[PDB]
Ligand SMILES: *[C@@H]1O[C@H](CO)[C@@H](O[C@@H]2O[C@H](CO)[C@@H](O)[C@H](O)[C@H]2NC(C)=O)[C@H](O)[C@H]1NC(C)=O
Ligand SMILES: *[C@@H]1O[C@H](CO)[C@@H](O[C@@H]2O[C@H](CO)[C@@H](O)[C@H](O)[C@H]2NC(C)=O)[C@H](O)[C@H]1NC(C)=O
Ligand SMILES: *[C@@H]1O[C@H](CO)[C@@H](O[C@@H]2O[C@H](CO)[C@@H](O)[C@H](O)[C@H]2NC(C)=O)[C@H](O)[C@H]1NC(C)=O
């Protein structure tokens with residue numbers, strides 16, 4: 001299964017405070033609208049590659 | 065992280081994970097004190113330039129000193145928007161600009177004599193006696209001759225690049 | 232798509248047809264010129280070797296490379312004030328309008344100083360200032376003439392133009408009723424002054440409407456000040472690039488000089504410092520060269536602005552399209568951030584008719600030519616009228632002159648010439 | 652001070668040449684500014700490096716000089732074009748352009764030569780004395796409006 | 800000024816002769832108060848070896 005990553009996967013590249021500024025930086029980011037594999041936990045915990053870094057997200061209602 | 069500057073209190077709301085701030089030029093703007101979680105601004109220590117305002121040495125050896133873009137703190141002291149001017153007397157009377165300082169302030173050597181600083185005039189005020197039925201028509205005239213000097217040419221220099229570099 | 236270049240419009244040319252305007256419109260156009268640029272100053276020693284004795288000692292081996300950049304920047308800073316002085320300080324006295332604005336119906340309240348403001352600028356000037364918007368040894372010097380003083384110079388020039396026409400430029404300001412000043416302005420473009428006097432109310436209303444349109448344009452069109460915003464942006468970009476260049480390594484192990492000095496012994500630190508000095512000196516030389524070229528462009532613009540001020544505001548321009556499209560009457564200066572704005576008042580023909588014409592009229596065998604104007608026919612009767620405004624008059628010996636005879640002039644027509 | 656516009660050009664060119672010549676005394680990182688002292692003391696493997704450093708410094712100095720001369724030459728060219736325009740429209744003719752040929756109403760001009768420049772003597776008509784008169788745009792006679 | 804212009808006569812005007820720069824008076828060294836100590840006590844002052 002795949003879903004749309006939309007605009008998720010952006011993190012603060014460093015610990016520098018900036019305001020009212022557009023800052024251009026090159027780092028390991030999740031490409032926008034890329035495909036991320038969708039796993040389910042109903043009614044599935046495989047081992048995945050790590051490559052050069054992994055973005056992880058989950059949705060919860062009972063802290064599974 | 066090291067540097068030189070003046071540390072002052074600030075009202076910048078740093079986020080708990082942010083430790084340093086930067087300006088548009090990528091220089092350090094502020095830091096969070098690692099012992100007490102307050103934000104301190106970093107203002108580089110005052111710097112600028114020293115200008116000497118003087119009448120020609122054929123008249124007097126008295127000079128005035130302008131410290132550009134500084135306050136009259138770190139340095140007969142007159143604070144102007146051009147910097148801190150020391151040695152020139154501030155005179156309320158305006159005159160034609162003589163030795164320009166900047167930001168509307170000029171200095172000159174006048175009256176016992178000393179260097180003074182003042183806001184320049186720009187000329188005498190002269191209202192025109194305008195009305196809807198009055199015309200001024202010249203009755204006499206003067207023929208004047210003025211001199212306008214323009215550069216036309218410059219010295220035709222020539223440099224032997226090989227002999228200059230590797231003589 | 233392939234661009235057009237405009238509508239196609241053939242002219243109804245023929246050997247005996249002339250179009251002469253019967254009505255006119257007074258238009259006001261806005262011309263914005265840069266006059267000055269930010270008087271930047273860079274401390275080459277502090278920029279290259281900030282608070283570093285070793286770097287300064289290595290820099291001293293390059294001789295005058297450092298101080299000649301300070302010299303070039305000083306020259307630029309000085310010529311920026313020379314440019315401002317040459318553009319605005321063209322009037323020997325500070326003139327002011329009378330308290331009673333009895334200018335023949337012409338409303339100047341939107342270009343004259345507003346006494347209620349903290350700085351006596353006009354409404355339009357206030358609109359202009361509201362549209363146009365480090366510590367590494369880079370400083371900015373203030374201008375010699377403050378915005379208030381520039382506004383005072385433009386006020387003096389405007390009051391002179393309004394109350395004395397062009398007379399204040401040549402010598403003393405000689406008061407003249409504004410309507411008569413406009414009568415001279417009309418005569419200067421080949422339109423007889425009675426056209427002004429008979430249409431004084433219409434002309435004043437057209438002028439006031441054109442000024443209102445200028446106000447709406449400046450209040451609504453942000454792009455109007457692009458010529459000045461581009462200069463401000465170029466100078467800000469040059470300074471931001473110069474400062475950003477300090478973060479470059481230029482081949483060194485680190486862009487931070489203190490990190491090199493604290494980690495390497497002199498035999499290697501001196502090499503890394505020489506690399507940083509070379510990179511930063513090249514950056515300064517590039518900046519200074521770009522500033523000299525931009526300063527030359529600004530100087531050319533300031534010289535053009537001063538020429539326009541002298542031959543447009545202080546006088547009346549016969550130069551086509553020098554002071555806006557149309558036949559130039561008068562111009563009014565307005566100040567702007569690092570520049571000057573000219574409001575050009577021009578006479579533009581508005582409505583025209585197709586008339587039949589002739590180069591000359593025969594009476595008793597004599598060839599009569601107009602003293603001023605041209606001969607026109609409405610299809611039954613021949614008249615003489617001024618070339619720039621239809622105003623038919625009976626053809627008389629006081630309108631025409633005799634030269635030669637009917638057998639020489641090509642296209643001469645038969646009519647009668649009235650003898651008063 | 653009347654000839655400052657020409658003296659400043661002469662001074663700028665003299666200063667540029669003095670700076671260019673003085674740049675030969677700089678080391679630019681070399682052990683010595685004198686090339687013969689490097690050649691007489693170091694073997695080729697080191698002399699070539701010291702020479703490359705001096706060549707880089709002196710070539711950069713020449714490039715700076717030439718760029719400054721090109722900019723100054725462009726300024727002088729603009730001034731010369733203005734002077735030629737004034738000559739044609741001021742000396743050879745009569746100028747209707749306000750303040751192009753001096754303050755006042757231009758009558759005639761006379762050229763004079765000067766070192767590396769031209770001097771114009773502008774003859775202008777300037778009103779000297781004035782009176783306050785009452786005026787009117789037109790006069791009625793028999794109901795007709797008369798204009799001058 | 801005389802040295803800047805390389806002359807013993809100075810014409811009327813304003814000349815830039817030297818750059819002013821405030822010097823620092825003292826250094827400031829900052830590190831957090833108590834990060835984390837190391838249990839060297841239980842190694843040296845161990846009850847039994
Ligand atoms: C117009 O002005 C000129 C000078 O600008 C006057 O000539 C002067 O007249 C006075 C007499 O009051 C003599 O004393 C001067 O020596 C004259 N000077 C020159 C240079 O000629 C002339 O008289 C004036 N004309 C009128 C009608 O007032
Ligand atoms: C010349 O043009 C002006 C406008 O450019 C005319 O003035 C207008 O006249 C109409 C009457 O048909 C009025 O409704 C408008 O309000 C007028 N406008 C202004 C600004 O006055 C003028 O009438 C024209 N003259 C001739 C002879 O046609
Ligand atoms: C000149 O124009 C200004 C506006 O451009 C006029 O000022 C207006 O006057 C009316 C009353 O007649 C007020 O209601 C407006 O609020 C005013 N506007 C501004 C911006 O001041 C002024 O009256 C005109 N004067 C003449 C003689 O026509």
Ligand SMILES: *[C@@H]1O[C@H](CO)[C@@H](O[C@@H]2O[C@H](CO)[C@@H](O)[C@H](O)[C@H]2NC(C)=O)[C@H](O)[C@H]1NC(C)=O
Nearest residue numbers: 607608609610611612613614615623624625626
């Ligand atoms: C061309 O102009 C002439 C001169 O005005 C016109 O002749 C007049 O016409 C009016 C009517 O419009 C009569 O009341 C006058 O008595 C005429 N005067 C003369 C001397 O003939 C003529 O009508 C105009 N032609 C056109 C086509 O408009």
Ligand SMILES: *[C@@H]1O[C@H](CO)[C@@H](O[C@@H]2O[C@H](CO)[C@@H](O)[C@H](O)[C@H]2NC(C)=O)[C@H](O)[C@H]1NC(C)=O
Nearest residue numbers: 592593594595596597637638642643644645646
């Ligand atoms: C204009 O009028 C003149 C006379 O005033 C005309 O000249 C006549 O031309 C014809 C043709 O050659 C001759 O036969 C007549 O003898 C000429 N008249 C005289 C008095 O000699 C001329 O042709 C007229 N032109 C037009 C275009 O009507």
Ligand SMILES: *[C@@H]1O[C@H](CO)[C@@H](O)[C@H](O)[C@H]1NC(C)=O
Nearest residue numbers: 001002003004033034035036
């Ligand atoms: C990702 O998957 C979606 C459908 O699940 C597809 O439309 C999209 O093109 C895929 N992305 C790429 C880069 O192929």
Ligand SMILES: *[C@@H]1O[C@H](CO)[C@@H](O)[C@H](O)[C@H]1NC(C)=O
Nearest residue numbers: 119120121122123652810811
């Ligand atoms: C001194 O030199 C200046 C030149 O700027 C000149 O104006 C002034 O008259 C001179 N004074 C004396 C006493 O020579």
Ligand SMILES: *[C@@H]1O[C@H](CO)[C@@H](O)[C@H](O)[C@H]1NC(C)=O
Nearest residue numbers: 133134135136137143144145
């Ligand atoms: C200069 O310092 C005084 C007090 O030390 C302060 O009131 C003033 O605003 C300062 N001026 C500037 C331009 O910093």
Ligand SMILES: *[C@@H]1O[C@H](CO)[C@@H](O)[C@H](O)[C@H]1NC(C)=O
Nearest residue numbers: 142153154155156157181182
């Ligand atoms: C100028 O006049 C004001 C009063 O308007 C006064 O307060 C000020 O001190 C005067 N300036 C000097 C230098 O005395």
Ligand SMILES: *[C@@H]1O[C@H](CO)[C@@H](O)[C@H](O)[C@H]1NC(C)=O
Nearest residue numbers: 242243250582583584585586
């Ligand atoms: C004159 O006649 C031509 C005929 O083609 C016409 O196009 C033109 O509009 C006419 N002029 C006016 C003012 O109407």
Ligand SMILES: *[C@@H]1O[C@H](CO)[C@@H](O)[C@H](O)[C@H]1NC(C)=O
Nearest residue numbers: 245246247589641642643644
């Ligand atoms: C104008 O040209 C036409 C031909 O197009 C000719 O018949 C007529 O006579 C000419 N008129 C004049 C005055 O030249």
Ligand SMILES: *[C@@H]1O[C@H](CO)[C@@H](O)[C@H](O)[C@H]1NC(C)=O
Nearest residue numbers: 192193200780781782783784
């Ligand atoms: C005209 O009258 C005004 C009144 O204020 C006066 O100032 C002016 O000098 C007079 N003109 C002449 C030429 O005297």
Ligand SMILES: *[C@@H]1O[C@H](CO)[C@@H](O)[C@H](O)[C@H]1NC(C)=O
Nearest residue numbers: 098099100101831832833834
């Ligand atoms: C460090 O100093 C702050 C400021 O007083 C204090 O609140 C904090 O408790 C100190 N750290 C520890 C571990 O006590």
